[PDB]
Design a protein around this nucleic acid. Structure first.
Ligand SMILES: [Mg+2]
Ligand SMILES: [Mg+2]
Ligand SMILES: [Mg+2]
Ligand SMILES: [Mg+2]
Ligand SMILES: [Mg+2]
Ligand SMILES: [Mg+2]
Ligand SMILES: [Mg+2]
Ligand SMILES: [Mg+2]
Ligand SMILES: [Mg+2]
Ligand SMILES: [Mg+2]
Ligand SMILES: [Mg+2]
Ligand SMILES: [Mg+2]
Ligand SMILES: [Mg+2]
Ligand SMILES: [Mg+2]
Ligand SMILES: [Mg+2]
Ligand SMILES: [Mg+2]
Ligand SMILES: [Mg+2]
Ligand SMILES: [Mg+2]
Ligand SMILES: [Mg+2]
Ligand SMILES: [Mg+2]
Ligand SMILES: [Mg+2]
Ligand SMILES: [Mg+2]
Ligand SMILES: [Mg+2]
Ligand SMILES: [Mg+2]
Ligand SMILES: [Mg+2]
Ligand SMILES: [Mg+2]
Ligand SMILES: [Mg+2]
Ligand SMILES: [Mg+2]
Ligand SMILES: [Mg+2]
Ligand SMILES: [Mg+2]
Ligand SMILES: [Mg+2]
Ligand SMILES: [Mg+2]
Ligand SMILES: [Mg+2]
Ligand SMILES: [Mg+2]
Ligand SMILES: [Mg+2]
Ligand SMILES: [Mg+2]
Ligand SMILES: [Mg+2]
Ligand SMILES: [Mg+2]
Ligand SMILES: [Mg+2]
Ligand SMILES: [Mg+2]
Ligand SMILES: [Mg+2]
Ligand SMILES: [Mg+2]
Ligand SMILES: [Mg+2]
Ligand SMILES: [Mg+2]
Ligand SMILES: [Mg+2]
Ligand SMILES: [Mg+2]
Ligand SMILES: [Mg+2]
Ligand SMILES: [Mg+2]
Ligand SMILES: [Mg+2]
Ligand SMILES: [Mg+2]
Ligand SMILES: [Mg+2]
Ligand SMILES: [Mg+2]
Ligand SMILES: [Mg+2]
Ligand SMILES: [Mg+2]
Ligand SMILES: [Mg+2]
Ligand SMILES: [Mg+2]
Ligand SMILES: [Mg+2]
Ligand SMILES: [Mg+2]
Ligand SMILES: [Mg+2]
Ligand SMILES: [Mg+2]
Ligand SMILES: [Mg+2]
Ligand SMILES: [Mg+2]
Ligand SMILES: [Mg+2]
Ligand SMILES: [Mg+2]
Ligand SMILES: [Mg+2]
Ligand SMILES: [Mg+2]
Ligand SMILES: [Mg+2]
Ligand SMILES: [Mg+2]
Ligand SMILES: [Mg+2]
Ligand SMILES: [Mg+2]
Ligand SMILES: [Mg+2]
Ligand SMILES: [Mg+2]
Ligand SMILES: [Mg+2]
Ligand SMILES: [Mg+2]
Ligand SMILES: [Mg+2]
Ligand SMILES: [Mg+2]
Ligand SMILES: [Mg+2]
Ligand SMILES: [Mg+2]
Ligand SMILES: [Mg+2]
Ligand SMILES: [Mg+2]
Ligand SMILES: [Mg+2]
Ligand SMILES: [Mg+2]
Ligand SMILES: [Mg+2]
Ligand SMILES: [Mg+2]
Ligand SMILES: [Mg+2]
Ligand SMILES: [Mg+2]
Ligand SMILES: [Mg+2]
Ligand SMILES: [Mg+2]
Ligand SMILES: [Mg+2]
Ligand SMILES: [Mg+2]
Ligand SMILES: [Mg+2]
Ligand SMILES: [Mg+2]
Ligand SMILES: [Mg+2]
Ligand SMILES: [Mg+2]
Ligand SMILES: [Mg+2]
Ligand SMILES: [Mg+2]
Lengths: 97, 147, 205
RNA sequence: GCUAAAUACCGGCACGAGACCGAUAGUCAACAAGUACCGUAAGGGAAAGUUGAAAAGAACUUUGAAGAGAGAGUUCAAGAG
RNA sequence: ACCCGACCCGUCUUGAAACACGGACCAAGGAGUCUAACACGUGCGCGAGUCGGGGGCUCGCACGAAAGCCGCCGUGGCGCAAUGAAGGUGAAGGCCGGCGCGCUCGCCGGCCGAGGUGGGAUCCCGAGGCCUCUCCAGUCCGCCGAGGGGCACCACCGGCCCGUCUCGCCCGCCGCGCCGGGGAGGUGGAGCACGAGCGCACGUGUUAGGACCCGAAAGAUGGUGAACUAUGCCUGGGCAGGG
RNA sequence: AGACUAAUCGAACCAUCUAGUAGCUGGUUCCCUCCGAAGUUUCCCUCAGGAUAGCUGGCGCUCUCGCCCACGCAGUUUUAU
RNA sequence: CUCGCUGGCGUGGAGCCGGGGUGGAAUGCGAGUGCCUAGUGGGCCACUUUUGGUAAGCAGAACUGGCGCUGCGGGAUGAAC
RNA sequence: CGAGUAGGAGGGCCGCUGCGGUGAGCCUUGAAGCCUAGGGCGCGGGCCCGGGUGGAGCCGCCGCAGGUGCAGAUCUUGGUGGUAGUAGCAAAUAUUCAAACGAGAACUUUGAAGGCCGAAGUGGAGAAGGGUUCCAUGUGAACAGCAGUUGAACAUGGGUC
RNA sequence: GGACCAGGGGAAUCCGACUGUUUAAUUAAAACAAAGCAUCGCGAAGGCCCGCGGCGGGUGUUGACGCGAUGUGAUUUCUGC
RNA sequence: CCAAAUGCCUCGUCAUCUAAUUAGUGACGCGCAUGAAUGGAUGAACGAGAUUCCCACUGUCCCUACCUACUAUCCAGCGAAACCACAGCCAAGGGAACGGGCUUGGCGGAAUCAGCGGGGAAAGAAGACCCUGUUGAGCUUGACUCUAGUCUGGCACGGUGA
RNA sequence: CGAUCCUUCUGACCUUUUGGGUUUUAAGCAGGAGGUGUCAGAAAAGUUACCACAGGGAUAACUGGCUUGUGGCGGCCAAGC
RNA sequence: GUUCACCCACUAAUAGGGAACGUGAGCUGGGUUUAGACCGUCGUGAGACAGGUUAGUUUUACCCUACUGAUGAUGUGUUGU
């Protein structure tokens, strides 16, 4: 009943099939595991943003807002828009003798 | 339909879709719920948490019969009556009000949500909840118990 | 045996059920037995209605169903005695009789007496010998149909209340409460001990 | 102490129906099947449907003693004897 | 005929032409089924509803063991509401003012009524120029900087209900009580945040059923055998000559 | 002598329960097109097996590229540390 | 601007509101995300690095590739070169 | 852009059998099957066409329903081979000559010789069990492990006081 | 003994007293039995046993010169602690 | 009582039997581990019991030969079966390490008879040894859980008198 | 250093004790213990040569192969004999 | 029972080995290694003992190959020398 015990032979090849997906970017990081006395300040700080300020801050924004030449030449000939008088001379152009 | 199966596709193949190596035999991990505590705890826990043990008081001869109270909320409260009456309760009259009875429709306890119709009412019920009773007092309505 | 996320299924199939299985392929046949049993009951009788014994009116005993009403089994002996008619007289009339049934409620009791006054008004009987006691004249060719359908009187007809409109008044929206349930529910649980705690207050002395 | 109903019926007496089986299938049994035959016995338990429209089942001639054949005939066919 | 290629198929197996196993040769038979239950997926019907599934009505018409109807047959099932061992309780906030020391602080009156931030298909407003003399004028197609209200959904904040814990305060009196109710916080919940189910059908999947077919050594129940043989038992029979 | 008890004995025979059970051997019936692995972790009286992850397949869904600078991603370097 | 936390300090720090400039190494690519689930759960060989052995076509590993799951051309022939 | 075991999906105008629908389909002027150095189609599953056999029913397309597709299981049942005109017909002393009947004689019958069982018999009679085996006549396809003109075989008819 | 008919013999060692029996079909043995010697239970409302049941049964148509239970295995000489 | 049917070392050591003896027999005993009804030791008779030696005998052998009977052998007659992938000429090679097939070579003719038994890892049974099985059965005691009976206690039948 | 189920103890002037009450007992909610050392937690002795079945070359005893310590055979150097 | 080992005698010498530890459908079955049994040690016990002693079924070739022996076989017209 003797067997083999532990090998990470062919584990590099399994992990990188789908790939090492790096989480790296998201916004507004989750707010668990936070120091609770800090949070026992900040929820109060949010509830008086609504109640405590309309007239002071919105008008304060209102105050500060009231405070506030040959090879260069053929591209102009052969441009799609800027060349219709370029054709003043080959089509109906001035050239003539 | 035996003509839409997987069996009718897998003829011609030897192991019939159950593996040469592992050999689908009879009942490998036992029958049914065998070894919940012993060798299927990573299945029983992490998928059925709390399957083993006791929590509470025993109650003998539990009838579903002395605990019968179908609820209602104040959304559906107007929906027992034809809405003919809520027009004629809005018809500028006075504090006259429809007497909505929830016991007729089968609903005993009136629970609450927000946002009840402005027009005054009278509810006749067996049980009330005090948020909903704060809502009927908001609109100037009344709150009548039936026994 | 169990696997990825699924519900614990405990069926009762260890017991060898295949010996004891009633199969309903005899279901259309009994249904045609039984129409032809009721219709065989229809043309035996006579003028008397099939489902002919009249049933009383009974409220359903619980807290769940006692807001509806039900044709019971038999008129109370004391109900049926207020109508004044004797017992085995009454079954020949075609009224159901039940000795076991009391009458606690005179609103229930008198409602059935009104029903018997209805049925005895309703009744067209025929005699053996026309000595004219409680019998009928040449009466609407056995009153236009011999047989009734699902009780003689439609026994359910569950009565509804209007209480159509009223002004809301002072002192009802001022006084009524959620809390007068909670005050009264807590009043009931403490009636035993509040009796005793004051009783041993004055027994102390 | 008694009492019809609706309820149950893979045995028995008749019976109609089948998105069934079509002889190695269906009952074990389409047939002289619980039979032939094995075991002292308790018991076990098979196989075996198909001529043609009709028997018209090949008279007679001819080798061998006959089986078996060559000629002949009946049949739409003896490549159904 | 010939050149070159060329070990005998299934099977377990790290590996089979294997000195591994099964396979003489042909014909027919022959092995993932069905019922229940749950789950996801998908088609169809209805939609805060859905379901006749059990009954009754049709005349008793071959196919009818079908189909059609009921609705004061919607009893009920599943869903709409949760949480707690249980008594039980049971989900609306936002805007403009007012009263007290306007405070670790709650209350009073209007007005819409499901919050907010970042993302966010699609849609709308679009400066701006673009098409034969020129002015002079409205439709017009397409491009369009930037801006706007923003779906589904995800990440985060706030709130609400219930069970709990710490904190302290005020009130109501079907009757003044170890009586009812409320607040601010912090955590437990299969919940709330304008619902999505239900009924049939089909697939795949797990499980209990003989359960993909064939396979033991056994276990029990209730029966027939001393015509062979083991031994008693009753009754019979048999054994030449010589030391 | 563990012998004999109907060619059966260290527990006969016959029929039922019984199609007993098996993680163990053997078999598992038409073609084509696409995709295509594992023998590793942890725990189990676990060591010839399962549970769970890993690996595989299928069915979808939500978006973006079609036009002096894009968004996003990585078995890679470069520059820092 | 808010704070009920911090505090000589209009200070510390978070949070919220409005305004102002897109261009911040190379390279390649279309990414993001949910459900259900089979099979698997006996491995083996090779360059270098390695532990037990005197050594092994031995036993145990790390990193990577392969045989397994895969033919073809070379090594006469062969699972891995 | 194409490899593929275990495996999972998809497409099939691939096949078999049964059911509603349709083909004013098909056929005693030849259906099913089966065979076929016959002509082809499809990558393939499989099909269509000709010829030959047989002689009474059968197939398409759209749906529906399967007890639906074999080389394997020391597969079940049926059937035939290579082995093969091979092993083999060898326990206990034995035959010979002639004659008759007969299609036909190493065995049947008679006759003579040569024999063995040798009175605990290869003899004369029974109990058990066998149940017509006893006897007679008749045939020669079976059977008697060669043969038969014979029998305890087959066929018919007798007998057990 | 003119064929048939028919005891090779001694010297001894180990095991068993001998005659008998046994593993039908792999063994006849030294294995089993055996007379001899002991030991023990029990005077019958009992010893030993059977029994699903009764004071039903066997020993028992018996009675310590007997039944029931074992060891040892002729004889002679011995039987330690 | 002894290297025993029991002595590990052991072919103990001596003596006798022999030209020569791990054998036999007699003797010696701190005898691996003899021994007293677990019966110790003797001993005539007996034995399809075991081991050794001598005399007589002879194909057991040296050393094989010959005759007879039946077969086998051949023919007339009737005639199976085990078995069997397709089959069968060898060396080395690699290969699952000991091939009829593959590779490189040796070579290789129809079809058979009578012998023979080297190979076919020949046939004959899903290994009786061994191992795994969360598979059993027979037996055993101070295994675990129980029970027939039995031994005593209590209640009922179960009273009268001193 | 230790899960469920069980037990035991403590905690609220706590919940339910089933027709309504009063009390004893019991049931619960919360947190401490009494154990599973095979230690993610079974309640447990032996022999089979009288053996049986499922199987394994995943696992011995025989050969063959790899290795050659040990055994066996030789070689180099020269203190010595 | 020997593989091995010593021993007496001969001799030129009585060298060592391999061929699935050659060779069992060639044999023999002494011992190892089934069931009987006795002894010794161990075990409370059934039983165990590379401890000792005895009694104990050795199957089939007619197939293909190889070999040995026996006829023949394709070509030179035929056949003979
Ligand atoms: Mg492992
Ligand atoms: Mg496959
Ligand atoms: Mg495995
Ligand atoms: Mg499997
Ligand atoms: Mg359970
Ligand atoms: Mg599973
Ligand atoms: Mg059962
Ligand atoms: Mg009574
Ligand atoms: Mg047939
Ligand atoms: Mg049959
Ligand atoms: Mg006919
Ligand atoms: Mg004739
Ligand atoms: Mg014809
Ligand atoms: Mg193979
Ligand atoms: Mg083999
Ligand atoms: Mg094979
Ligand atoms: Mg074979
Ligand atoms: Mg078939
Ligand atoms: Mg669905
Ligand atoms: Mg309802
Ligand atoms: Mg058992
Ligand atoms: Mg039994
Ligand atoms: Mg019995
Ligand atoms: Mg007899
Ligand atoms: Mg024995
Ligand atoms: Mg026998
Ligand atoms: Mg046994
Ligand atoms: Mg089965
Ligand atoms: Mg059955
Ligand atoms: Mg079975
Ligand atoms: Mg691919
Ligand atoms: Mg494991
Ligand atoms: Mg296996
Ligand atoms: Mg994928
Ligand atoms: Mg699968
Ligand atoms: Mg898996
Ligand atoms: Mg290794
Ligand atoms: Mg593999
Ligand atoms: Mg690969
Ligand atoms: Mg490769
Ligand atoms: Mg190659
Ligand atoms: Mg090479
Ligand atoms: Mg190769
Ligand atoms: Mg492919
Ligand atoms: Mg067709
Ligand atoms: Mg067809
Ligand atoms: Mg069918
Ligand atoms: Mg089938
Ligand atoms: Mg196959
Ligand atoms: Mg086979
Ligand atoms: Mg044959
Ligand atoms: Mg012959
Ligand atoms: Mg011969
Ligand atoms: Mg003559
Ligand atoms: Mg003649
Ligand atoms: Mg004689
Ligand atoms: Mg005689
Ligand atoms: Mg005769
Ligand atoms: Mg004659
Ligand atoms: Mg004959
Ligand atoms: Mg006869
Ligand atoms: Mg002596
Ligand atoms: Mg004797
Ligand atoms: Mg014998
Ligand atoms: Mg004596
Ligand atoms: Mg007695
Ligand atoms: Mg003395
Ligand atoms: Mg000698
Ligand atoms: Mg001793
Ligand atoms: Mg002693
Ligand atoms: Mg003594
Ligand atoms: Mg060779
Ligand atoms: Mg070789
Ligand atoms: Mg090798
Ligand atoms: Mg070799
Ligand atoms: Mg071979
Ligand atoms: Mg070749
Ligand atoms: Mg020959
Ligand atoms: Mg031979
Ligand atoms: Mg051999
Ligand atoms: Mg063999
Ligand atoms: Mg086996
Ligand atoms: Mg295990
Ligand atoms: Mg078991
Ligand atoms: Mg109670
Ligand atoms: Mg553990
Ligand atoms: Mg045992
Ligand atoms: Mg292996
Ligand atoms: Mg050496
Ligand atoms: Mg050998
Ligand atoms: Mg021997
Ligand atoms: Mg021996
Ligand atoms: Mg023995
Ligand atoms: Mg002892
Ligand atoms: Mg002998
Ligand atoms: Mg041959």
């Amino acid at each position: 009943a003797k067997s083999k015990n532990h090998t990470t032979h062919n584990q590099s090849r399994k992990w990188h099939r789908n790939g090492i997906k790096k989480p790296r970017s998201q916004r507004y990081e989750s707010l668990k595991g936070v120091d609770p006395k800090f949070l026992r300040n900040m929820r109060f700080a949010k509830k008086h943003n609504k109640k405590g300020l309309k007239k002071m801050q919105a008008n304060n924004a209102k105050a500060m807002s009231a405070r506030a030449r040959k090879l260069d030449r053929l591209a102009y000939i052969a441009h799609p828009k800027l060349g219709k008088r370029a054709r003043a001379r080959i089509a109906k152009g001035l050239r003539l003798c | 339909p035996s003509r839409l199966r997987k069996t009718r596709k897998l003829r011609g193949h030897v192991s019939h879709g159950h593996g040469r190596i592992g050999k689908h035999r009879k009942h490998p991990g036992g029958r049914g719920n065998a070894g919940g505590l012993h060798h299927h705890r990573i299945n029983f826990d992490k998928y059925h948490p709390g399957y083993f043990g006791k929590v509470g008081m025993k109650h003998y001869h539990l009838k579903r019969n002395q605990s019968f109270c179908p609820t209602v909320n104040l959304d559906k409260l107007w929906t027992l009556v034809s809405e003919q009456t809520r027009v004629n309760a809005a018809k500028n009259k006075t504090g006259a009000a429809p007497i909505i009875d929830v016991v007729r429709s089968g609903y005993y306890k009136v629970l609450g949500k927000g946002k009840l119709p402005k027009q005054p009412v009278i509810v006749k019920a067996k049980f009330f909840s005090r948020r909903a009773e704060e809502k009927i007092k908001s609109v100037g309505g009344a709150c009548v118990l039936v026994a | 045996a169990p696997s990825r996320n699924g519900m614990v299924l405990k069926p009762h199939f260890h017991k060898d059920w295949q010996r004891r299985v009633a199969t309903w392929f005899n279901q259309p046949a009994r249904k045609i037995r039984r129409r032809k049993a009721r219709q065989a009951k229809a043309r035996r009788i006579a003028p008397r209605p099939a489902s002919g014994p009249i049933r009383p009116i009974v409220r359903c005993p619980t807290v769940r169903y006692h807001t509806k009403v039900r044709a019971g089994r038999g008129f109370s002996l004391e109900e049926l005695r207020v109508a004044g008619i004797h017992k085995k007289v009454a079954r020949t009339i075609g009224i159901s009789v039940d000795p076991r049934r009391r009458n606690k409620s005179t609103e229930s009791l008198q409602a059935n007496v009104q029903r018997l006054k209805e049925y005895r008004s309703k009744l067209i009987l025929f005699p053996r010998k026309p000595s004219a006691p409680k019998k009928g004249d040449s009466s609407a060719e056995e009153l236009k149909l011999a047989t009734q359908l699902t009780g003689p009187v439609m026994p359910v007809r569950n009565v509804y209340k209007k209480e159509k409109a009223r002004v809301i008044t002072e002192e009802e929206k001022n006084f009524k409460a959620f809390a007068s349930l909670r005050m009264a529910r807590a009043n009931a649980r403490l009636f035993g001990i509040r009796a005793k705690r004051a009783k041993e207050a004055a027994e102390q002395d």
